[PDB]
Amino acid sequence: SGFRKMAFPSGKVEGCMVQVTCGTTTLNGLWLDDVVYCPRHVICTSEDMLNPNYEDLLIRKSNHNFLVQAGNVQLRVIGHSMQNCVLKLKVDTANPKTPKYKFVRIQPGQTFSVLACYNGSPSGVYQCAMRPNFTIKGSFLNGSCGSVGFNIDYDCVSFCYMHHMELPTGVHAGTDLEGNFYGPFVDRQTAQAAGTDTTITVNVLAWLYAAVINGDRWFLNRFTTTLNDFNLVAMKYNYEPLTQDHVDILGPLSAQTGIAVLDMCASLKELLQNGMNGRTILGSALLEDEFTPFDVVRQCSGVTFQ
Amino acid sequence: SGFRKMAFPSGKVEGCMVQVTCGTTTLNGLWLDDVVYCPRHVICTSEDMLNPNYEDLLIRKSNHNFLVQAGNVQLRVIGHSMQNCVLKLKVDTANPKTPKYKFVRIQPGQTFSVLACYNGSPSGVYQCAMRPNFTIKGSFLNGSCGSVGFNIDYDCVSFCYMHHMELPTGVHAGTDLEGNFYGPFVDRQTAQAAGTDTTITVNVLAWLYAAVINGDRWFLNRFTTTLNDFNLVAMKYNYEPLTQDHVDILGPLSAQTGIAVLDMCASLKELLQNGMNGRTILGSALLEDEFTPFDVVRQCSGVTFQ
């Protein structure tokens, strides 16, 4: 029992992180086989970030302008290509520690672990969600660019995020590992306001099932509701609409607890309308939305990784 | 910017975890050099846990009764000794992945990362605190015994916790790596009620400095206080007494923010007396007490590990 914000073990990713320096800009790269992936804004100075022309800045860059360091060892760069907002630096040495891996583009609401790095060295690991406005609420200082977000299924690392920018509101934006930003964000130091940070309704429901499995039951009310009646209450509180697909995904937690999905919706509706009256749920005085249904099952079942 | 519950990267510890089976009981061991450390209750059946005589149960156990498995490889056990509540199984192969390490016994209020394991395989990593009642609020299912808690200073892993038991209230108890329980807990399946779970006052203060550094300033009030006046308010709310040593430790956060420690105490006193009025601080509607002053500095400075 107990329920924590749990990250994936970071060992398989720690062995992939390097340092990439181009001129006076230093950030993190990901070394998988004979390719290092990093943010293309490695080629920019502080002044270039206001209005950068990446094609033009790239012309003054050769293979030898990219210093890739893994510990006390420099990798030789044998080729470079810009794919969307990432650079692919081809190196002459395949990473001996390369794990089984995949690149995935995740949906809003999906969670992943971040290994925050500085100078190609890991600082720590935490669990994040891709918010419905395509920002993440991370912990990133100067130098953290090129840190990655990932999921693990047994022995295969699914890379889903690379860190590129902090918006003026202190929230984060970045790309998949093909270099395509999540949401409308660009790698320019300009005005880019995030949209409404809506709550991930299906994740709140998962987390309430986790509470029930763990003994926190005070919020279980006497009521049920429909998807349409719940969505009319949800809209007011900036909650994502709940769909049939969401009901389906909560099926296994429904089955384990014997609480119907729509009964758990009516409990949630009462928490939204009435508040929590200073009570807590799994030691939080807010409704937590950064656990997926999959995350609840995994943590409550003790699923392990090769 | 941003502030997360951040664990240490788990790679150095992942490579130390093994599976230990004695008869029909399977749990986790820690393989450091040619010694595997595990909970002595590996030698117990379910019925033995009600009233176990460890010296007597140990007499029916030989070197060959301990099956230690690292992946598809069995380690040979060449000696065993019980030290307090841990077994030290001497194996013929020194762990090639042994990192620089230390065993430390931590104080109440200190934080550490847990690598939760099942069958010697890592499931995930999270940040915990040793509570003032010497319990931890973890996430542990059947089979998690022998999972470890640790801190990292550059390249040296300080092991501080091994998981042994879940109390009937769903909170956790375990030992240092010399096998001495934290607090009055024993490895028996009996009535052992935890004392008052008091709030770690110095950690709340650290976390309020983190909030200030990150832009959350609404709670900064117009007042100051003394240690004695604050402690008279703290006692009522089951907050640990604040000492001069605590004031000293908050010195660096005081210096960085320009907010005197006693001014931050008066802000805290107002939050305790008046509540948070449904406002949040670093996305929490409660006062978080599982960040040390050291943890705030580390996360706000970007300290990395070799």
From Swiss-Prot, chains A, B:
There is a cross-link at residues 5, 90 (Glycyl lysine isopeptide (Lys-Gly) (interchain with G-Cter in ubiquitin)). It catalyses: TSAVLQ-|-SGFRK-NH2 and SGVTFQ-|-GKFKK the two peptides corresponding to the two self-cleavage sites of the SARS 3C-like proteinase are the two most reactive peptide substrates. The enzyme exhibits a strong preference for substrates containing Gln at P1 position and Leu at P2 position. Inhibited by pyridone-containing alpha-ketoamides compounds 13a and 13b. In turn, alpha-ketoamide 13b (tert-butyl (1-((S)-1-(((S)-4-(benzylamino)-3,4-dioxo-1-((S)-2-oxopyrrolidin-3-yl)butan-2-yl)amino)-3-cyclopropyl-1-oxopropan-2-yl)-2-oxo-1,2-dihydropyridin-3-yl)carbamate) inhibits SARS-CoV-2 replication in human lung cells. Inhibited ex vivo by michael acceptor inhibitor N3. Inhibited ex vivo by compound 11a and 11b. The active site is at residues 41, 145. It is found in: Host cytoplasm; Host Golgi apparatus; Host nucleus. Residues 1-306 form the Peptidase C30 domain. Residues 1-306 are cytoplasmic. 3CL-PRO exists as monomer and homodimer. Only the homodimer shows catalytic activity. Interacts with host FBXO22; this interaction promotes the proteasomal degradation of nsp5. Cleaves the C-terminus of replicase polyprotein at 11 sites. Recognizes substrates containing the core sequence [ILMVF]-Q-|-[SGACN]. Cleaves and inactivates human TRMT1, preventing tRNA guanine(26)-dimethylation of tRNAs. May cleave human NLRP1 in lung epithelial cells, thereby activating the NLRP1 inflammasome pathway. May cleave human GSDMD, triggering alternative GSDME-mediated epithelial cell death upon activation of the NLRP1 inflammasome, which may enhance the release interleukins 1B, 6, 16 and 18. Also able to bind an ADP-ribose-1''-phosphate (ADRP). This is 3C-like proteinase nsp5. It comes from Severe acute respiratory syndrome coronavirus 2 (2019-nCoV). The gene is rep. The chain holds residues 3264 to 3569 of 7096 of the full protein.
